[PDB]
Design an enzyme around this catalytic site. Sequence first.
Site, mmCIF file in Angstrom:
data_model
loop_
_atom_site.group_PDB
_atom_site.id
_atom_site.type_symbol
_atom_site.label_atom_id
_atom_site.label_comp_id
_atom_site.label_asym_id
_atom_site.label_seq_id
_atom_site.Cartn_x
_atom_site.Cartn_y
_atom_site.Cartn_z
ATOM 1 N N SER A 187 0.808 -1.236 0.000
ATOM 2 C CA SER A 187 0.000 0.000 0.000
ATOM 3 C C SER A 187 0.836 1.278 0.000
ATOM 4 O O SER A 187 1.648 1.518 0.868
ATOM 5 C CB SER A 187 -0.895 0.000 1.228
ATOM 6 O OG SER A 187 -1.939 0.976 1.227
ATOM 7 N N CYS A 188 0.584 2.159 -0.943
ATOM 8 C CA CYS A 188 1.256 3.468 -0.952
ATOM 9 C C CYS A 188 0.139 4.477 -1.173
ATOM 10 O O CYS A 188 -0.610 4.296 -2.119
ATOM 11 C CB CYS A 188 2.331 3.521 -2.072
ATOM 12 S SG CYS A 188 3.114 5.144 -2.223
ATOM 13 N N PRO A 189 0.015 5.535 -0.332
ATOM 14 C CA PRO A 189 -1.106 6.480 -0.533
ATOM 15 C C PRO A 189 -1.024 7.316 -1.832
ATOM 16 O O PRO A 189 -2.024 7.904 -2.264
ATOM 17 C CB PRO A 189 -1.010 7.395 0.688
ATOM 18 C CG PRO A 189 0.471 7.420 1.022
ATOM 19 C CD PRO A 189 0.875 5.943 0.793
ATOM 20 N N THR A 249 2.532 0.837 -5.301
ATOM 21 C CA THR A 249 1.811 -0.285 -4.696
ATOM 22 C C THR A 249 1.991 -1.545 -5.522
ATOM 23 O O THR A 249 2.302 -2.594 -4.991
ATOM 24 C CB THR A 249 0.318 0.038 -4.578
ATOM 25 O OG1 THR A 249 0.189 1.138 -3.685
ATOM 26 C CG2 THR A 249 -0.485 -1.142 -4.054
#
Length: 105
Positions: A9-11, A17
């Site tokens: 997960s990467c915002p 991601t």
Amino acid sequence: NAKLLAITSCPNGIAHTYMAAENLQKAADRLGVSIKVETQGGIGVENKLTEEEIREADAIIIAADRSVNKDRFIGKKLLSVGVQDGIRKPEELIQKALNGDIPVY
């Protein structure tokens, strides 16, 4: 014979991601380890882990640059790192996960 699961997960966007997920998958294949990677991107969760897969897993890897809810992983050995580690040192995460020196969440 080992079974791992992972979440990435990467915002920011989706490419990071996915790159973490791709690189964990290839590292697992190289190491002859089974892995399934669930992604948590802006678009939602994809390739969601099942309850049964989680019960059987030897360990869980989370490579994320945002907080990931870990309630599904109570009683599981869990390794929690940045997305960059998932992209850049996936073999070392898989090795550390299976060396067993990781706390039970």
